[PDB]
Design a protein around this motif. Sequence first.
Motif, short mmCIF file in Angstrom:
data_model
loop_
_atom_site.label_atom_id
_atom_site.label_comp_id
_atom_site.label_asym_id
_atom_site.label_seq_id
_atom_site.Cartn_x
_atom_site.Cartn_y
_atom_site.Cartn_z
N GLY A 162 87.89 10.97 75.71
CA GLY A 162 88.35 11.83 74.64
C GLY A 162 88.09 13.32 74.79
N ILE E 2 85.70 10.74 62.45
CA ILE E 2 86.27 9.67 63.26
C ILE E 2 86.08 9.94 64.75
CG2 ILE E 2 87.93 9.19 61.45
CD1 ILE E 2 90.00 10.61 63.15
N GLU E 3 86.35 8.91 65.55
CA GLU E 3 86.34 9.05 67.00
C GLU E 3 87.47 9.97 67.45
OE1 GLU E 3 84.12 7.63 69.14
OE2 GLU E 3 85.08 8.63 70.84
N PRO E 4 87.21 10.90 68.37
CA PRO E 4 88.28 11.80 68.83
C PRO E 4 89.35 11.12 69.65
CG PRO E 4 86.13 12.78 69.17
CD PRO E 4 85.89 11.34 68.84
N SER E 5 89.07 9.97 70.25
CA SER E 5 90.13 9.23 70.93
C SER E 5 90.90 8.36 69.96
CB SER E 5 89.55 8.35 72.04
OG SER E 5 88.79 7.28 71.49
N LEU E 6 90.23 7.84 68.94
CA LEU E 6 90.93 7.19 67.85
C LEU E 6 91.68 8.20 66.99
CD1 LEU E 6 90.38 6.12 64.62
CD2 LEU E 6 91.64 4.78 66.24
N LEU E 9 94.45 8.22 69.03
CA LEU E 9 95.24 7.03 68.76
C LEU E 9 96.09 7.22 67.51
CD1 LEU E 9 95.31 3.89 67.21
CD2 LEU E 9 95.89 4.14 69.64
N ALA E 10 95.53 7.90 66.51
CA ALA E 10 96.31 8.21 65.32
C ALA E 10 97.33 9.28 65.60
CB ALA E 10 95.38 8.64 64.19
N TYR E 13 101.27 8.58 66.23
CA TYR E 13 102.10 8.09 65.14
C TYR E 13 102.33 9.10 64.04
CZ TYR E 13 101.40 3.48 67.13
OH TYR E 13 101.38 2.41 67.98
N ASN E 14 101.49 10.09 63.91
CA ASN E 14 101.72 10.96 62.77
C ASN E 14 101.76 12.44 63.11
OD1 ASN E 14 98.96 11.45 63.24
ND2 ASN E 14 98.30 10.28 61.46
N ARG E 26 111.65 13.44 60.96
CA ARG E 26 110.73 13.30 62.07
C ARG E 26 111.49 12.84 63.30
NH1 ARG E 26 107.60 11.31 57.84
NH2 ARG E 26 105.65 12.44 57.49
N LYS E 48 105.90 20.28 65.47
CA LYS E 48 105.22 20.16 64.19
C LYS E 48 103.94 21.00 64.21
CE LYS E 48 104.14 16.90 60.60
NZ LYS E 48 104.10 15.50 60.15
N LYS E 49 103.82 21.91 63.24
CA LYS E 49 102.72 22.87 63.22
C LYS E 49 101.40 22.18 62.91
CE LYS E 49 105.38 26.97 61.97
NZ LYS E 49 105.12 27.74 63.22
N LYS E 50 100.34 22.67 63.55
CA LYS E 50 99.05 22.00 63.60
C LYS E 50 98.17 22.48 62.45
CE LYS E 50 99.80 23.34 67.35
NZ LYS E 50 101.02 23.91 68.00
N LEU E 51 96.91 22.06 62.48
CA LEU E 51 95.87 22.66 61.65
C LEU E 51 95.09 23.69 62.47
CD1 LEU E 51 94.70 19.46 59.87
CD2 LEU E 51 96.35 21.16 59.07
N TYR F 94 88.17 4.84 59.34
CA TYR F 94 87.59 5.21 58.07
C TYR F 94 87.36 6.71 58.09
CZ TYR F 94 86.31 0.39 59.00
OH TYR F 94 86.30 -0.94 59.38
N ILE F 172 99.26 14.75 56.06
CA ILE F 172 99.18 13.57 56.93
C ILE F 172 98.56 13.88 58.28
CG2 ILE F 172 101.30 12.82 55.81
CD1 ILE F 172 102.52 12.90 58.68
N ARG F 173 98.39 15.15 58.64
CA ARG F 173 97.76 15.50 59.90
C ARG F 173 96.31 15.93 59.73
NH1 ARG F 173 101.17 19.75 58.54
NH2 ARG F 173 100.25 21.85 58.61
N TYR F 180 96.65 1.69 62.13
CA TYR F 180 97.60 1.91 63.20
C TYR F 180 97.47 0.78 64.20
CZ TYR F 180 98.10 6.44 61.03
OH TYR F 180 98.33 7.45 60.13
#
Lengths: 189, 94, 172, 68, 52, 191
Positions: A162, E2-6, E9-10, E13-14, E26, E48-51, F94, F172-173, F180
Amino acid sequence: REKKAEYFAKLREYLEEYKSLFVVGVDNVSSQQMHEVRKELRGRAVVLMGKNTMVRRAIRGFLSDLPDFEKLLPFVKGNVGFVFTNEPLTEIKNVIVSNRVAAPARAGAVAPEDIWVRAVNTGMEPGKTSFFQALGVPTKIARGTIEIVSDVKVVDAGNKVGQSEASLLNLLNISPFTFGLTVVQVYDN
Amino acid sequence: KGIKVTVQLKIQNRQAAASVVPSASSLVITALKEPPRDRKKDKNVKHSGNIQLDEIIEIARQMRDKSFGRTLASVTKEILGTAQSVGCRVDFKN
Amino acid sequence: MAHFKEYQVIGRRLPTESVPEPKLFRMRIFASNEVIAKSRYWYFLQKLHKVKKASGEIVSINQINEAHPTKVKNFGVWVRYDSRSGTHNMYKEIRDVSRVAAVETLYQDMAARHRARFRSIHILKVAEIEKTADVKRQYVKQFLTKDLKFPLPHRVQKSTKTFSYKRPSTFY
Amino acid sequence: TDSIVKASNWRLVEVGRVVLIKKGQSAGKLAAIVEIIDQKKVLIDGPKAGVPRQAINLGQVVLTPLTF
Amino acid sequence: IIEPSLKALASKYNCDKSVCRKCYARLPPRATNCRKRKCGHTNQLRPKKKLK
Amino acid sequence: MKYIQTEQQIEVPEGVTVSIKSRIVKVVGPRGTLTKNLKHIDVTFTKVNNQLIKVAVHNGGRKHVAALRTVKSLVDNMITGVTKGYKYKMRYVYAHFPINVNIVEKDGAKFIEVRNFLGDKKIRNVPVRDGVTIEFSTNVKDEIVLSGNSVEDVSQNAADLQQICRVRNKDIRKFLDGIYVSHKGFITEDL
RNA sequence: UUCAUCUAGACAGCCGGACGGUGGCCAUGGAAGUCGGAAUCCGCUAAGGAGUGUGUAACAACUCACCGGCCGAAUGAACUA
Ligand SMILES: [Zn+2]
């Protein structure tokens, strides 16, 4: 042609006077270390690779340099080419027997082997202080030094690493890209 | 010898630095030729001149981490007068 | 506007009595009959040379048929026309029997696909290409294999009367 | 343990096939379809029942199960 | 946290998927045209613009 | 451009068994039989010899001959899926709240649900088709592993379990919490 | 239509690279490979820039143009109506 603008005088003068061959077969290779260990002892030998017509180089250079062209075709595999020689391998395994230095596969991509932790003397300091400072390993600044006392179970095989986790393994400059430069094909004199 | 953006390749040993300078190139004309490389550095640019400068081609990559492999004489036409523009003294200017 | 014909038309540009015996031009024209053929001559020739029909005559009108209208032969045809945005060349290829029977089913898609019509088409040369499998529009090279098998499905039957008793099948 | 498909059985048009004219001049006499010229038209010559060698289309003939 | 690889993983999709600059749907992050009819399968696609 | 004729190579392994009338498919493999329905494509099939299947839309258009490669890959998935099936990795996440997806069995209908999603009070619920059977990855935590002999009825019964978890009227970001799907696989070994 | 490929093996894909100086000059509080002015890299190669897009304020970490290997033959662009 888009790809073969200069290929007739590419290596049909290189091996024109060379009869004892050392070969190279690899994908596990760098660039920085690689083409500058193409700058190892050059001055009398040349380094190159072929391409797509190496499947046809069995029947491209059929002008009979040496009449043992059965030894030529069935190793069109990997970054494969030609590092010529005159004399045999009697001292060639005294230089590149275990040479490696690299960065890992991209940003923390795949890597085969496993490492293990041990209480040693490193003595580091908080630099970029957002990597690993609360993940459970003791970064207890022991009035100047760091001495780890933990036995962590993280490192696995076949990883896709990661964000900051690919600069914990790269804190110790770990590279899985060994390739002591091999000679696999039997061809001499 | 120099005050430009100093690259460090410094594996330290008992406080003694590696006493060869990897030498960001601030002393390539101001050594024994004209002063305008390091002297007169905030008056105008240092892309001035194509004059008869040097034939000390051996020493040139002896300072800046010699990495030619095949020919160092291909790099001696290639930093002073190409990466800079103060002295080249040959018309391979392309 | 029929099944077409093909002609030679032999024009001459009337004898000046300063210098008689003019130069005898000759063409190759597609035409529905012999008397649209004469008026296609004084429309192609007025693009080339200083004539008109009140400045010339027609020596002879010799209708051609092909030496072998019984074999098949792959053609390549150069036409030019103008659809309403501008004048455009270019090319087609027909797999057809004779030189007159190809230019129908050349005009019977250039009127169907690009929506030009007969006062606009200018056929340049109906080239019978030399042999098989050295041709460049690959959609006739559907027809250049050995053992060209295909069944046609869905054999519809004609209706002589208007009340079958059968719920018709379409086995072929 | 049986990997069967049913028949895949129609008639086909082959180079040198026999065929039965249905409309026009020939009117119900056995031609012989020899050579395809396009998808919607073909060559026929069966010249022992009085037919010339002309190119006919396929919205006009029907087919027989014989093949030589 | 959260995990940075998860998180990655998210992220498939978004987070990082392209968007039409004319009909706002989209779109998958490499795509030449769009996929629909009220935009006419147009050819402008901002990412898509980031944070930040 | 009116293609003439088109066939391809559908492979059949040694244990599975394909017998077809008109264009519907019967298939029985080593892991429980199936049958499906494909009466909208106007093809014809030919088994040549015990392991290989033809398809044919001759005198096809161009949108016809896109739909033969799609039934190189609509009858193979049930051929693989009767001897492999599909197996699923669906990692949880979570941000602040837990998730306890567990299979209650209301009305004897075996409906999967999710509590405590982003602090909600609605009891969610998902209808569950047959074919599938939910199991969890034991002690390698917080995934869901969905078995089955089907192909569409497993990853609509998976795709409509990773879209209940949409958070609405927020970002959502940043609100990346949800459900998922990580990596679908086949239940057989090395997969 | 107009180009370049095209069984010397192509394209879409997938294995691994992608730089040593140089943290090239100027401008810079801070310019490094990816804020900028001006030009317009060598070595070898398979090939890598005095950089096609991200990222540290600046270092560095990535994708890449650019490539050598498995499949292995047909592929890509700009226009037209
Ligand atoms: Zn749109």
